[PDB]
Amino acid sequence: VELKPSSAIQRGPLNKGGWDAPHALHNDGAIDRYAHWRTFYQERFKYTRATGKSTLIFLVAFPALIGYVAYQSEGLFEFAGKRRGESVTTRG
Amino acid sequence: MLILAIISLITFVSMSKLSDNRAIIRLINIYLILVLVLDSFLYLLFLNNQTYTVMGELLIFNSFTFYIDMLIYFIMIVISSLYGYNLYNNNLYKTLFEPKKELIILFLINILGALLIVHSNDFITLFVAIELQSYSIYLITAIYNSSYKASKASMLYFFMGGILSILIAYSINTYYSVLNSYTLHSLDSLIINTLDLNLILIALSLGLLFKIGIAPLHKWLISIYENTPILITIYISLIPKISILSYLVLSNISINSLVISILAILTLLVGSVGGLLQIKIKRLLAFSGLTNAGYMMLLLLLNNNEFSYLYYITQYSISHLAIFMIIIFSIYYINYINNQYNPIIYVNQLKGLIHDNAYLVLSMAIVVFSFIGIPPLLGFFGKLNILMSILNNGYYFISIVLIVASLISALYYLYLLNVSIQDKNNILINSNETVSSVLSYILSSLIILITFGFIYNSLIIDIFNVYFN
Amino acid sequence: IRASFDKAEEPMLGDYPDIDPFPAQL
Amino acid sequence: ALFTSLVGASGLGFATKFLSNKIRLKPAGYYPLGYVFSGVAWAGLGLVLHNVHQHSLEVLEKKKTAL
Amino acid sequence: FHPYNTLGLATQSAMVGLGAGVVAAAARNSLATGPRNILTTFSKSGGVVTIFTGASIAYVFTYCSAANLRERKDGWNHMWAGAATGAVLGARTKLVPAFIGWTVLCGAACGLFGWTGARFNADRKASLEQSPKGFVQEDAHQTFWEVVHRRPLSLTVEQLGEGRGINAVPIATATEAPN
Amino acid sequence: MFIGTIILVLSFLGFVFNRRNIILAFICLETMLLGINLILLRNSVLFDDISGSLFAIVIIILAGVESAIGLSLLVSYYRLRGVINSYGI
Amino acid sequence: MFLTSILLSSLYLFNRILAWQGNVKHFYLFASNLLLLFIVVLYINFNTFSNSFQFNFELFNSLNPFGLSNSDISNGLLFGIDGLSLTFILLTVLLIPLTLLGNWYNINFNSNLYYTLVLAIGLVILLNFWALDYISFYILFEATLPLLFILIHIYGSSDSERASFYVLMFTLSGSLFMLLSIVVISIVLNTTNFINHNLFVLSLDLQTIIWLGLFIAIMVKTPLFPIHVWLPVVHSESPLAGSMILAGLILKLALYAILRLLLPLLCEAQILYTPMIYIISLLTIILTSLATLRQIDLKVIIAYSSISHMGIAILGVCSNTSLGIYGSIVLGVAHGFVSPALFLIVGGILYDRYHIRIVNYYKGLTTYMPQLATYIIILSFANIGTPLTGNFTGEFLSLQGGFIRNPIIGGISCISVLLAAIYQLKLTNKLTGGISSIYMHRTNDVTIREKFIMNILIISTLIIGICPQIMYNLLYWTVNNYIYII
Amino acid sequence: IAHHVDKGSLYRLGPVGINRLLNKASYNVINLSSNTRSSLSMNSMLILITIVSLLLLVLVMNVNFIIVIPVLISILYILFS
Ligand SMILES: CCCCCCCCCCCCCCCCCC(=O)OC[C@H](COP(=O)(O)OCCN)OC(=O)CCCCCCCCCCCCCCCCC
Ligand SMILES: CCCCCCCCCCCCCCCCCC(=O)OC[C@H](COP(=O)(O)OCCN)OC(=O)CCCCCCCCCCCCCCCCC
Ligand SMILES: CCCCCCCCCCCCCCCCCC(=O)OC[C@H](COP(=O)(O)OCCN)OC(=O)CCCCCCCCCCCCCCCCC
Ligand SMILES: CCCCCCCCCCCC(=O)OC[C@H](COP(=O)(O)OCC[N+](C)(C)C)OC(=O)CCCCCCCCCCC
Ligand SMILES: CCCCCCCCCCCC(=O)OC[C@H](COP(=O)(O)OCC[N+](C)(C)C)OC(=O)CCCCCCCCCCC
Ligand SMILES: CCCCCCCCCCCCO[C@H]1O[C@H](CO)[C@@H](O[C@H]2O[C@@H](CO)[C@H](O)[C@H](O)[C@@H]2O)[C@H](O)[C@H]1O
Ligand SMILES: CCCCCCCCCCCCO[C@H]1O[C@H](CO)[C@@H](O[C@H]2O[C@@H](CO)[C@H](O)[C@H](O)[C@@H]2O)[C@H](O)[C@H]1O
């Protein structure tokens, strides 16, 4: 026996059956490449002295500064209806 | 019932030609069903976890072992229908999937060795039964001696299983040298604390566990499951793991081992990582069986692990049969046959299967998402119970490794589904041949259980809270 | 003229042409 | 309840027959008697679990009564 | 706490890591493909010796040192030790970013490993199974795993702090009319 | 306790570091089983117990059947290949 | 009568309709409009004078699995609604027919599979709000992944495959740590139900831990910085119903998850770890807005805006104030009206006509496609939060409460009022502006189907923008149940 | 931001970096049982290594456990690098 698929299977092409509409876009070839690049930048991104600057800024320093601000100013201000001379803070 | 089967089949098969082998398989299939129907009432004896010792003190019968016995039979009535009911009555599928004469005898003898292990209460019965399960499965790998790869497989499995039987017997003889006993019931809190038996019992666990593919000795078993025929791979890959894991779960040997924690972590990492680049199906599913062996190893450390084990072993077995069955059905719709024994090897041969048979792919998705642990499929409710037990007993790093291993294993589990729902040219439009009725109904029934068996979880919990408590 | 940001992206272009920018307004 | 359980177990049984017909690439109404056979068979399975659970609930109730 | 002995543990750890390098060297010499001999063990080995020794030295030295500098026993120490180990292993690849990445991520993994208790095993008495659980009975101190229907207010003010809505006495009763 | 451990260890090492053939592997398995039985029978004498000798006789049976099955498997390999080369399994 | 006979009548009618006309979308549209009406009837019969849960039904009980349980021992999945859940329920029944009708003519291969998958996702989302126990929530939280993966992989755009693995793996990752927290709850409390889970006062040290696993999940679903990178891709390559369903409802599930799991329990961990939440929400707002300023794909830009408005809504709900809750909810509602309209405009109008999403081609629609211009500007000014639209009233209230909790962070987050305008108007000006693009030929103006949809999604937000007080009748309890203030 | 963070480090701590990390680790896991020339002696040597490694690892972690940890980090490197 030669091991081959059964001949009772009748096969044919895939016709999704959409109505092929006219050309309402003129592809440009360079815009598409610019988009492919800006879309798959992640697979070519490399670490260097500017990428590192931006990365450490926006993922170390600014988060740490915002957190220092928060965890100092946690329960500090409370000034609903306050009046002259009264302190707006709950701490020193 | 097994014995009268094995005894009768020897005579009845010697009296019978090569042309009756399918009918004889069908007979023993129906016979096992009649056992499982008519003798199943014996679960009443195990009310309130009444436990019985038999043949002296060699065997032990409780609800755990009985359920494992029913499961092994349910596996063995599905694994037999695969040999005794031809899919398509074509010459190709005659040549591809034809049982041999002695195969069924070796299956039942392996069932017997599996059940003597779980039912064992003394190490002597364990050593006799693991040798029975081991020798029967050397021969099952080797019975298809017209293939080169199976010949290589049985030879390696013989040697590397013999080495582990040596390790097991060395451990038993050490336990006897220390304590003058072959019975683990002769242990207790006093004797555990008072004696340095940690080394002497982990050596038992490892000598049993390296026979099921635990890391870093996974490769040899993976080469075997790949190189052997698919309808043998579906049996060898499951039953030995059930038997040995059940024996190690029932006997609360390794309560809080550090070695077992390390190895089980390594299995989850290996079985999740090394199965990503695989292009072959069987190696992919073998690495899947390994990571599931990792998850089930993690409840050897618990001392209350029956429900989580029973639920996971059941859904694992069901999903394992169903996925291999889907792979078997799909052989009709592919373009290239690679072998007389392994018609399908590479995952990229299932391409476009949605355009041929879509409901086969629905079953594949249900089964895949069950492996991953997507609810409301049964795999969720199984991995949930494991997480409950380990977190209730104090393993936290391992739970994170467990989560991570599930995520990593989604990728090699979804490779099948991704290529299956891809598009293909030269689709199927008609075929006057039709697949068998029984195998379709079996596959369907396993699918419907993986899908809807979440409905019965409370009922199962009530029955468990009576018969196991 | 290639500005700072536009020549910090040199290692990443791969095959893309490293054009010299000129704003259209000029 | 019993009757609700049996209709549901029959509903799983029709799903097995239907899914089996589709896996064979047949129409859903190929062999209607298979729907009836799958219904009664799974209905028996759900019935068995119904009686098992009833016996177990009675047992725990009996444990409380002898208390 | 009780301080650590940095040099005693570091010398033991280095001899151990040297021994592990010897074992892995011999195992590679046996498992490898091409013609080899008893000479190749320390020549053709991919730095298994320096890998193991530098890691064990750096890990144990940093853990004991920062346990003694912080003067505590906790997970932050294992984080620093995994940070050193990642530096050592990542120095092998002669790149800055991979060195930084190996450091941070090996440190986070060891730091998690110290968070969960610095063990792959379990305590088995701090666990939920072997410990008191459920509802505490009568006003007793609420342990970790125990549940409580009504909590004290002094304990809340201490654990959390005052302000941001949370106070020593409620707002109405504080501003009730003495009438 | 000594002689058995020594035969067992040396035969495991000669099983593991055999770059030559396969009959050495069969032999090392049989010698490992021998050394086990000697360990066990020494302990059974010192304890004046019988369970050791029972497990020993059982090992003899099981080892002989092991060699029978192994030497049928080898014959299958040889059926197909015609030569059992030094580095084939 | 028999319950089984009624649904057998329905299934039979469905089989005959399927056999005569080989399509289902008419029956599904009928069922969708039926569900909308039946939910409206439930609102008519819903008492607003009760904080209790109404229309309780239990499923999958031991005694009556395939029916409902009237037992004295409840071991199954619970269901029922408060006014919070009813709100998003009304949002979901309102959107499902439109998500089908936004794809009534452009799906031409295996259509019936698509409309099945859409309705299954929409029904599963609907039932998730009825959920009254942690486990039923979770098993309906994770049930949309297989359908979303399949839907995206088949009916998706070019890069569908990468998008489908991203929606699965990211959401599964966050969900699994949610499962760990739920499992720790379940082995401790030995009960999971959204009725009496606030009574149990766990120790603080354990709330500090359970919170981390719940919040890891909610970071991954909402999303939030720095796990905001799946959403742009999954929206970019998804079919139109996938994008509408996602932005409208699945991101609102994260907010419902906070209010229903994380606040009534874990109160003390919220009041201790809130400042870290404010850090994360603030970074989400500004960085995603600035990342939006330099994108090229239309659909990705709308996606980034969804991240921003959710991050404002997190400032409000996590603010320990009534106005914060009522704003964060109204943001979720108005967002689930506005964003689907924009995803329809950029995914089922322009992509249908010209089959490309790059801004560089698009310019000068106002000349030949004026009505599309009018809708773009209205929805753009509703997205950014022009008043008399719910996306302002919710912005204002959440920033009231965020300012109350931490005034600095709640005021530095007011720049969202600007940055939303930047990344939306830089685009709207391009589309409606200039001379018609040479690359694009002409095509029809918007058809009545799409005009129907956009006019519904605008009337609804204008209503809640003009009188938000209508939604208070369901929420006047919910604004105070989840406030931990002594 | 959009390039160096949203499409840079935040894809590296995610899809891109995990993909490369798993590419290598899987290619080093499977390139471990190197020679197919004889699958027997190799798996046999793997038994001997594992038994010896566990006996020695347990020896170290009896006397001190904070020393075996780097041994395991490095082993994971050797197995996955
Ligand atoms: C089968 C093939 C035939 C060949 C057989 C060869 C002989 C077999 C040797 C024994 C059996 C193999 C054992 C396999 C390894 C696994 C051993 C094991 O895991 O036991 C560990 C166990 C403690 O682990 P656990 O119970 O999990 O945790 C609680 C800890 N308190 O228990 C222990 O704590 C272990 C006890 C610690 C002492 C270990 C002894 C090591 C001594 C070696 C010193 C070498 C000298 C220095 C180096 C020399 C090189 C120059
Ligand atoms: C002699 C003097 C003694 C002095 C006293 C102190 C001695 C202490 C010795 C410590 C033990 C050292 C053992 C070193 C490991 C064995 C060496 C080795 O090479 O292992 C890998 C081995 C061969 O691999 P190789 O040939 O190098 O090819 C590499 C390409 N991948 O291939 C293998 O398959 C064998 C693997 C063996 C693994 C053993 C079990 C390790 C368990 C893994 C730990 C995981 C736990 C951490 C998980 C964290 C999760 C993130
Ligand atoms: C008791 C303490 C135990 C606790 C555990 C401690 C962890 C120790 C981990 C060390 C064990 C060895 C595993 C190291 C990873 C193996 C591969 C590797 O070395 O990483 C390098 C890889 C290279 O990337 P590239 O430079 O582009 O490719 C050229 C490489 N020559 O790098 C990359 O691909 C880029 C990396 C980018 C960063 C990705 C960060 C992902 C973090 C989540 C990881 C989750 C998956 C964990 C996988 C486990 C694998 C073991
Ligand atoms: C048992 C055959 C297994 C073969 C595989 C088929 C699954 C059957 C599961 C019934 C178990 C039982 O009903 O039992 C419940 C058992 C203990 O009860 P028991 O002592 O064994 O008595 C049973 C007496 N029977 C045999 C006469 C009925 O609790 C467990 O931990 C089982 C956990 C199994 C989880 C798998 C759920 C699958 C959904 C099943 C939908 C019908
Ligand atoms: C407050 C709730 C909404 C109130 C109702 C507003 C919608 C009424 C329908 C307007 C139709 C129209 O304006 O025409 C649409 C105009 C057409 O321009 P044209 O004059 O007809 O000449 C045609 C010459 N073309 C073809 C060259 C243009 O498209 C545009 O140029 C884009 C401008 C949109 C103006 C939006 C009106 C102000 C509403 C802003 C409130 C947020
Ligand atoms: C650009 C990439 C490179 C930068 C990466 C930045 C990632 C952050 C790494 C630095 C981590 C330093 O983390 C540091 O914080 C902890 C507390 O938070 C300090 O440890 C402190 O913990 C507190 C508890 O919170 C203790 O009670 C004690 O007071 C101690 O001083 C440790 O000294 C150190 O572990
Ligand atoms: C991401 C979420 C899921 C991640 C998985 C982890 C979740 C499980 C929680 C880990 C709990 C660890 O908790 C462990 O430490 C706590 C202290 O904090 C200990 O709690 C004990 O601490 C001692 C002090 O040492 C005090 O007396 C305290 O009253 C209590 O008895 C317990 O011995 C143990 O329960």
Side-chain angles (χ1 to χ4, degrees), chain B residues 40 43 67 70 310-311 314 449 456 460 463-464 468, chain D residues 49:
Chain B
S40 161
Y43 79 105
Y67 177 89
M70 281 188 282
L310 285 182
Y311 191 93
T314 303
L449 292 160
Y456 286 109
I460 294 295
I463 291 155
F464 181 92
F468 273 87
Chain D
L49 285 155

Side-chain angles (χ1 to χ4, degrees), chain A residues 52 55-57 59-60, chain E residues 70 72 74 76-77 79-80 100 104:
Chain A
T55 290
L56 61 92
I57 283 168
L59 296 165
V60 173
Chain E
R70 287 156 29 69
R72 275 197 202 74
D74 268 342
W76 296 114
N77 314 310
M79 185 262 280
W80 289 122
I100 287 159
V104 166

Side-chain angles (χ1 to χ4, degrees), chain G residues 184-424:
Chain G
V184 179
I185 287 153
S186 304
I187 62 183
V188 173
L189 300 174
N190 297 106
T191 188
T192 52
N193 55 336
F194 300 159
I195 318 173
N196 64 342
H197 66 300
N198 47 15
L199 280 55
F200 304 109
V201 179
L202 310 164
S203 47
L204 173 73
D205 303 68
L206 185 61
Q207 299 188 16
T208 44
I209 291 147
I210 280 168
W211 188 99
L212 282 161
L214 287 179
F215 194 74
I216 280 165
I218 289 153
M219 285 169 69
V220 178
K221 302 307 311 297
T222 308
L224 290 179
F225 198 82
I227 310 166
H228 69 280
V229 304
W230 69 280
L231 190 150
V233 181
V234 166
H235 283 67
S236 186
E237 315 300 356
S238 44
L240 165 57
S243 303
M244 294 159 80
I245 290 293
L246 272 160
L249 308 168
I250 280 171
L251 279 64
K252 281 56 164 195
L253 276 178
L255 194 151
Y256 177 93
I258 293 160
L259 289 167
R260 188 69 90 206
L261 293 69
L262 195 149
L263 291 190
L265 188 64
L266 317 179
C267 301
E268 293 85 26
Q270 174 83 44
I271 198 75
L272 273 187
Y273 282 160
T274 307
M276 185 180 290
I277 294 164
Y278 270 55
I279 294 160
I280 283 174
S281 64
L282 182 144
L283 298 162
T284 300
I285 284 155
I286 68 180
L287 295 175
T288 61
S289 312
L290 297 175
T292 313
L293 302 174
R294 290 291 304 278
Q295 305 298 345
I296 55 176
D297 191 327
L298 288 173
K299 197 177 282 206
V300 161
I301 284 158
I302 314 307
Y304 274 110
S305 73
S306 293
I307 291 154
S308 159
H309 296 293
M310 291 321 302
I312 294 163
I314 294 286
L315 287 176
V317 66
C318 293
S319 86
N320 201 7
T321 44
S322 307
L323 295 148
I325 306 308
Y326 190 83
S328 186
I329 290 152
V330 174
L331 284 175
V333 162
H335 191 231
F337 291 147
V338 163
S339 281
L342 293 164
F343 281 120
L344 173 62
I345 280 161
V346 307
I349 295 190
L350 292 166
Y351 178 85
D352 280 345
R353 277 155 183 73
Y354 315 98
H355 299 316
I356 192 69
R357 288 198 296 258
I358 315 301
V359 285
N360 308 108
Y361 294 104
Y362 288 111
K363 182 178 63 153
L365 314 178
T366 314
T367 308
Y368 300 114
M369 284 70 87
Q371 300 186 333
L372 187 56
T374 310
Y375 283 125
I376 280 158
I377 293 162
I378 291 175
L379 294 163
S380 287
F381 275 115
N383 183 18
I384 65 175
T386 305
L388 309 195
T389 67
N391 306 74
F392 163 75
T393 304
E395 279 182 4
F396 179 26
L397 282 181
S398 306
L399 290 171
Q400 258 174 28
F403 191 75
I404 286 160
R405 185 68 178 75
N406 203 298
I408 280 169
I409 303 301
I412 301 280
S413 189
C414 294
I415 65 183
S416 72
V417 172
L418 181 56
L419 304 181
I422 302 187
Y423 66 69
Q424 194 60 68

